[PDB]
């Protein structure tokens, strides 16, 4: 019965959401820092911030439209019938599931943005000096990079949720505390911090193509974690639309 398109003008379509943060992947990994390409230093790319909140909102809005269904869903369907309150403990473990990774995925993304946003700023403390040496303001990109250390955003979890099977799910990438509070790792945001110098350095094309390849590991490393949760984020996606589909089964079974 339920089918995709069924779906998709319920105003369910995963398809946004996921293409949304996708194309907020595929901007970050378009960042780089200034290099020697082809007898020339090429500055870094500029990243485009708006991209990051398009993909926060959309996913804000495919929750909210997922729930308005799983609602619509559930009030239809409404000694003893064991179906009624199967299904019914299951509609309470996907609207969970809904908020939960709508909430991970929006934090997660302001922390990749405020990422792309640094890789971009740093592009003006980074220059060549001759055309064997570059010059780099190690100091004022740290600072740049400890900003974004200290206003890491905060999530909380959906009241009530399996905390222990949260961070087995979510990853070394973050981190949850008794409370689900969830916080993010800075592990890759300090190795990078820590890889910078003195304001004022100049170092040899070697000496910084060493660094830059270090560095550039790093955020890589961070676009996978993104990545990774992304596509953890979609077999949501994709179990939703299988519990609709199962719900509308049942109703239809149902009734009568």
Request: proline share 4%; no cysteine.
């Amino acid at each position: 019965a339920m089918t995709d398109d069924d779906l998709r003008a319920a105003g369910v379509d995963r398809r946004v959401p996921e293409q949304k943060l996708g194309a907020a992947i595929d901007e970050f990994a378009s960042l780089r820092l200034p290099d020697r390409i082809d007898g020339r230093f090429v500055d870094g790319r500029r990243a485009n911030l708006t991209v990051f909140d398009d993909a926060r909102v959309a996913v804000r809005g495919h929750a909210r439209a997922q729930r308005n269904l799983l609602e619509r869903l559930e009030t239809e369907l409404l000694q003893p019938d064991p179906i009624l309150q199967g299904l019914v403990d299951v509609i309470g473990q996907g609207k969970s599931d809904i908020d939960a990774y709508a909430t991970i995925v929006e934090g997660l993304t302001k922390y990749f943005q405020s990422v792309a946003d640094v890789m971009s700023k740093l592009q003006d403390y980074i220059s060549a000096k001759d055309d064997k040496n570059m010059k780099i303001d190690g100091g004022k990109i740290k600072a740049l990079i400890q900003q974004v250390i200290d206003h890491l955003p905060t999530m909380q979890l959906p009241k009530g949720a399996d905390i222990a099977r949260w961070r087995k799910e979510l990853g070394d990438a973050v981190s949850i505390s008794d409370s689900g509070v969830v916080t993010i790792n800075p592990d890759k945001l300090i190795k990078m911090r820590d890889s910078l110098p003195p304001d004022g350095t100049v170092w040899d094309t070697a000496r910084y193509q060493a660094w830059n390849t270090a560095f550039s590991g790093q955020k890589d490393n961070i676009q996978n974690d993104v990545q990774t949760l992304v596509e953890k984020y979609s077999h949501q996606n994709s179990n939703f639309d299988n519990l609709v589909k199962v719900l509308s089964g049942a109703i239809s079974t149902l009734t009568d």
